[PDB]
């Protein structure tokens, strides 16, 4: 086509989606990770995670307001990944890299899994 | 912070949101523009438009499944802008620039209004 493109548009949209998350506006699901609860937008979760994409395209699960993750999932690892989904920034540290990678594998977040594997290979 | 960032994340999220729109997945509102209807995600509309942000943060309107736009709004101008919201690409042409600018002013999409004004000033 003969379209023009606004370079910063995708980043501006994500920034605004994160502002809605921070003010709890139009969040439509709670993700339960053991004793912790995380409110989010189903669409953003599906856009970032192969697991949430499969969950919310299911004709029964698409209507659930609460999703319980596997008990092996670490709430901090999930929190770091939820922040990444809404910001593109990943808080990857020596103390959390194993939990973050395990959570990204479960959530099916291929690019996060890839950088975790590379950072782990560099430290061995 | 000491975060790393995935450059393509925001663009990949928006691409996936557009795929959900194309398959009509988790769309939660209909925008009526005269005889035409457009299905969309409330969060994406709010993230792109000052008008939709004001509409869906209103305690009564946040719950509406149908929003009727002003009758002066052109359905093609709206369609072009809805496509821009989900893709960052604007199909701006000599034949549609006036309708697109008028629609972007009503929707409160400042960057679109700015490029329309510049393209119009160049042709005079």
């Amino acid at each position: 086509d003969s379209c023009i493109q606004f370079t910063r548009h995708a980043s501006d949209v994500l920034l605004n989606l994160n502002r809605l998350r921070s003010r709890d506006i139009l969040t439509d699901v709670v993700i339960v990770v053991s004793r912790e609860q995380f409110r989010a937008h189903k669409t953003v979760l599906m856009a970032c995670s192969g697991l949430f994409y499969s969950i919310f395209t299911d004709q029964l699960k698409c209507n659930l307001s609460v999703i319980n993750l596997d008990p092996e999932i670490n709430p901090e690892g999930f929190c770091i990944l939820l922040d990444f989904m809404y910001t593109s920034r990943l808080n990857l540290r020596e103390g959390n890299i194993m939990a973050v990678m395990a959570t990204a594998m479960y959530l099916q977040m291929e690019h996060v899994v890839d950088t975790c594997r590379k950072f782990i290979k560099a430290s061995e | 912070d000491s975060c790393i960032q995935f450059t393509r994340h925001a663009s990949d999220v928006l691409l996936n949101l557009n795929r959900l729109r194309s398959r009509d997945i988790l769309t939660d509102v209909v925008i009526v523009v005269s005889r035409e209807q457009f299905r969309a995600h409330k969060t994406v509309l709010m993230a792109c438009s000052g008008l939709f942000y004001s509409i869906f943060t209103d305690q009564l309107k946040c719950n509406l499944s149908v929003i009727n736009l002003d009758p002066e709004i052109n359905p093609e101008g709206f369609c072009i802008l809805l496509d821009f919201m989900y893709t960052s690409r604007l199909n701006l042409r000599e034949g549609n620039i006036m309708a697109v600018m008028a629609t972007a002013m009503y929707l409160q999409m400042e960057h679109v209004v700015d490029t329309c004004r510049k393209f119009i000033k160049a042709s005079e």
Binding site: C3, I4, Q5, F6, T7 | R89
Partner: peptide, 4 residues
């Protein structure tokens, strides 16, 4: 704005 750019030519994509």
């Amino acid at each position: 704005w750019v030519i994509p």
